[PDB]
Design a protein around this ligand. Structure first.
Ligand SMILES: [Mn+2]
Ligand SMILES: [Mn+2]
Ligand SMILES: [Mn+2]
Ligand code: NA
Ligand code: NA
Ligand code: NA
Lengths: 497, 498, 498
């Protein structure tokens, strides 16, 4: 997936009171910082220099054009000198893209010997940013605040992380989701108000019949299915039974047909996420398995059993984790392992696990019996899950508002092999332990379908929740369950209304 | 300036159930305690013995008289034996002065040999104060609670500090502020709802024209300024350029004239705080600088750019220290020092920093170029800031309610001197560090004008906020940024319409 | 007075299901309606016909441009056929302009002979707008809803009123107010949160010193002052004492200087409303009187004693009263007349009554001793107020939110003359009576300064409050006071927190 290049407008605030001379000093400092801060991180995204802003009307024009530009994904604001905040009121009302408030100073030390009134009037960010911060508090605007020196490497790393989530938010705003079928019957976590989700996040989620998708698979070029079968054999290890032209190899060709038809449909409608349900497979030979795994590799959002929210959420987590070495997948929490030394959980799905979370071992393509769905034996990629720290998140619908639950876990490498299990799986230790992660997750109402990621941080998800105006609950190393209960109660009283 | 000398009514509660004989022992215990707490680092600070209260009408008469007496600055109540709390209901409704609930005991140990029913009927505060406590919670009255023995130095230290806070609150109740000019143009944090401020704290904030001040400076005694120059030369070190008669010497006498005229005007209207703006000086020669520093040392609250909130807060924070050393000043956060190891902050203003916060060096009188204001080069005191634990306070207006933000800092001594810097300055390390103190302060909506003090504690500011019915957020050594965000949200849910 | 010409984007909605052919009839009907809808009360403002919107991206781009174009002052939307409302969500999210929802039908009768499936697929507005209506309720966006046929005269007349108030709303967002001095001291209703007012309506209210204005009166060319004095003799009826060359004629020249300086400064800062206070007049010869009333006729908003809220309201009511009778003025309720048959009120100010509300008798230029202000005797216009139905409105600050109180009155012609009264005055009968309107007004917290106007209706003010998101209470003929109390109570619980 490629996305429209996004920009970030770097804006400095100032006054006319300190003279026409100081304005040149500010402009010079900013023209010095923006390209050097664009070196940093850097090349992935674009920092554009949008001038010094001194009057209310000038800044109002800026944030109105920012709200009109689809390429602008956020404004970074910094008060170099003292800018009076009432000028920013009329402006902040119109600006809708996310605001980063960069509280920095140009110089790093105070020149104790040669500091005069002119310097004290030029590099006074310490209270100008305080003024701006107050206006941001009194208007109640969603804002990230990053404090430090702009040459300090942690501030640069934080800027990169924020820009990543901001472009993910921009894609979320125009997000299209396609559902083939309906929900698994009587399932509650999968249900939500689509209209409320579009007013909150902007997701347009629409339901198509499965027949339209079968119709799209009818018009796929078979030359392409054989050429794609060649790429499968080059990338994955086909079972010897399926390396020759038997019945098991036609199931792989059938899954290639399904993938190409899904590609055609998703590309025609500008969809970035889709969902399928096993309860509605009238016209397909087999339940889509390998196809959805490859589409997840391509960058598409997916979730099973008709879960449009979790699919959308993984699409957003896919986009906010372009620190190339990602690792992101649809997940379900299947079973526990209660051994006192290493309490761990085995997670997977019926078929649809993305290979982004795999191990250096090349995944193996296999066909095996799947009785859930009542269809033909499906083809799937099988692999063990990698090892490292990760986060698994789920978005749920409380009825009047959304909740984002994120649990930091550590994925561990499997000690033993699992020979009779014919689906890809991953093993992890949740934090702060098994009993406390599970208890806290149940208390928060967490879903069973989860979005697992190696490259999304807790900061990124908290920042997305802040841009979207939704509660974010975090279960990590410091989470006590007794206090987590009261945290939930107080959050519910805050977010009501 | 000085204050109308406030007293504190000490009241002990009991009932008629245990007999008239026990009542005499209770009154005796209280008559023993009151003078001991009236020496005990008390005085100057007068504790009056307001009798034992046993009847509902007796109690309500007391708190009705207390709310009508302007000299009473607070009631301290202690339940010696079990006094039923419904008698206090009608009372607590009428009392409008700060309440300290002293949960104490007369004796220190249990006399294991001679304890009987008669002893258990005298010193049952352990549950009597619980009874009273419930009525304080169920009626929702603002009360401070101090637990311990009345000879414990911790209880005495907290009583003294609380009496300071209560007298500061009493001064806040009748606080008058005079504004010379308007707000600095499009500045938002300096602006606020005056009427909402009178209903919350009682501050009478009124704006006078700047010409009304010039009218007062014409009527100053011309040799009163010469008399003030002698005090200047005795206390401060004038630059040699100003020790004889030249252009530098006229600038010092003009600031002395400004000081004398301001004194006359502020005392004429019983004002205790005032504000000036550099945008409105259409009759003065120079922006008031030396004069403002002298008046802040005299005990007046001041803030620049029309900041009546910061000025009022400075006057009350000056008063809650009354007998300490003691520095307190109006301040603005001017520059950072990002030396990896030395998170440091340089704070000052254009001119108006109080010498109460200075070091031991006697301040220097100077004249230098001030480009903001367009007036004459003004004379001011310059000095380096002292070192010690300190507080940064700011009162802000969220629109429907006020917020008091308090940051604990440690002021450090300047290692190098700043020769070309023509303003007095102070250096501090904020807690828990600079980076996340700034982060949390921006998140909390803190103003740029801050009230700096060496002698005011966080306890005092929390207690003032408790008496005033306003949210108080404290950012100190234990303050984390992640939890600070959600704690702010929960505070907003509690204080929204309270 | 300038006022940038504003346009209104007219948008029709439908879908792609009914074909490229049905879309053509939709577009054809719309280009027939829009120019025909610009005939009717459409000469001040321009109705622009924007594309038919059928997909979410067209709607989003349209509503993004509408909120980005400064010339667009509002969108008029009509669902010709069934447009699914989810496509409209993101657009309504981005739209920051007033929305009028016109629920109409192209044809007026249904052709019983030729009605088939195609007719039911083309003119299904009756349910197409209902879908849209739900989203307007579900997102909680401010909406006017007008139902009827697009050739019906009442819908067109209501469209005119809404377009006037929408242009006034566009002017409110760019409203600048300049204050010469502060509020009248210790006056509470005139005080408010300026920052909250910029967040609610967009008013930028800033205070300049009166010396800044005196400087502008010093730099006015007196040649122009004499040229304006020449206009005075042609328009107004000067007192015999002042038609010759003496001291009484110099007061008119001084007010001409005041007018020229006020104009110069007000246009120098692009201000549209201003306030002056008599408690701060250091540097002016006389309290501004004639000048302020002439500038109020020019289209400026004014209020005395520093009343920026009433000043802004006067400008907004002046702008929505561009059709056209159309008197509008600053007001104060000075005295009652308790004659049990014609209970009426006499209203005016110290000097500052705008001649827009005058009668046809030519106003008289007069000078008399004015002790309020303590300055020289000022020149002023004197006249009696006209007659007709009118509204006097007041905007007040509840601390956490604003309230717009509107009382409909009937202005009466004076029966007796007022020879010794040296101020312009107006007499009116409030509804439903004097003693009942006064009770309702006191309960609603109405100010003493009121904005009185003959040409702005109650609907326009109700709709302005709806566009601004503020409570509007109306006191008219049907107002019972018993139920008026409860309306206030229920409104207070609804309006806390938005
Ligand atoms: Mn399942
Ligand atoms: Mn300042
Ligand atoms: Mn008045
Ligand atoms: Na499609
Ligand atoms: Na006075
Ligand atoms: Na100007």
């Amino acid at each position: 997936m490629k996305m429209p290049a996004y920009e970030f407008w770097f804006v400095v605030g100032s006054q006319h009171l300190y003279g026409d001379e100081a304005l040149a000093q500010v402009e010079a400092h900013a023209r010095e910082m923006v390209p050097a801060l664009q070196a940093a991180v850097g090349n992935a995204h674009v920092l554009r220099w949008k001038g010094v802003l001194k009057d209310a009307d000038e800044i109002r024009r800026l944030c109105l054009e920012a709200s009109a530009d689809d390429v602008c994904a956020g404004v970074i604001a910094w008060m170099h000198t003292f800018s009076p905040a009432k000028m920013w009121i009329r402006g902040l009302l119109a600006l809708r893209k996310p605001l980063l408030h960069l509280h920095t100073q140009f110089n790093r030390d105070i020149p104790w010997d040669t500091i005069d009134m002119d310097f004290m009037n030029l590099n006074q960010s310490a209270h100008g940013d305080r003024e701006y911060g107050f206006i941001g508090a009194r208007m109640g605007v969603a804002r990230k605040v990053v404090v430090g020196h702009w040459e300090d490497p942690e501030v640069r790393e934080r800027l990169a992380k924020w820009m990543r989530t901001a472009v993910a938010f921009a894609e979320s705003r125009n997000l299209k989701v396609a559902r083939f079928g309906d929900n698994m019957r009587e399932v509650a976590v999968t249900e939500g108000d689509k209209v409320g989700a579009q007013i909150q996040f902007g997701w347009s989620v629409n339901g198509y019949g499965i027949g339209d998708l079968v119709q799209y698979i009818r018009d796929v070029s078979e030359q392409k299915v054989n050429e794609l079968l060649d790429e499968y054999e080059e990338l994955y290890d086909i079972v010897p039974a399926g390396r020759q032209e038997g019945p098991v190899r036609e199931s792989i060709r059938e899954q290639a047909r399904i993938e190409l038809g899904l590609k055609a449909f998703l590309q025609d409608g500008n969809f970035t996420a889709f969902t399928t349900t096993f309860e509605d497979l009238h016209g397909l030979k087999q339940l889509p398995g390998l196809a959805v795994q490859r589409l997840m590799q391509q960058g598409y959002g997916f979730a099973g059993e008709g879960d449009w929210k979790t699919a959308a959420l993984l699409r957003i987590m896919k986009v906010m984790s372009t620190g190339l070495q990602g690792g992101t997948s649809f997940m379900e929490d299947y079973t526990y392992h209660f051994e006192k030394g290493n309490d761990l959980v085995l997670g997977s799905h019926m078929l649809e696990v993305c290979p982004s979370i795999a191990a250096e071992e090349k995944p193996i393509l296999d066909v095996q019996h799947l009785g859930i769905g009542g269809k033909d034996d499906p083809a799937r990629l099988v692999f063990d899950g990698g090892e490292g720290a990760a986060v698994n998140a789920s978005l749920i619908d409380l009825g009047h508002r959304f909740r984002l639950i994120v649990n930091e876990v550590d994925a561990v490498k499997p000690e033993h092999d699992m020979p009779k299990l014919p689906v890809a799986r991953i093993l992890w230790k949740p934090r702060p332990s098994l009993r406390d992660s599970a208890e806290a997750w149940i208390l928060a109402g967490g879903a069973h379908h989860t979005c697992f990621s190696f490259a999304v941080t807790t900061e990124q998800l908290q920042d997305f929740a802040e841009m979207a105006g939704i509660e974010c609950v975090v279960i990590n190393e410091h989470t006590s369950v007794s206090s987590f209960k009261n945290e939930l109660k107080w959050n519910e009283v805050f977010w009501r209304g």
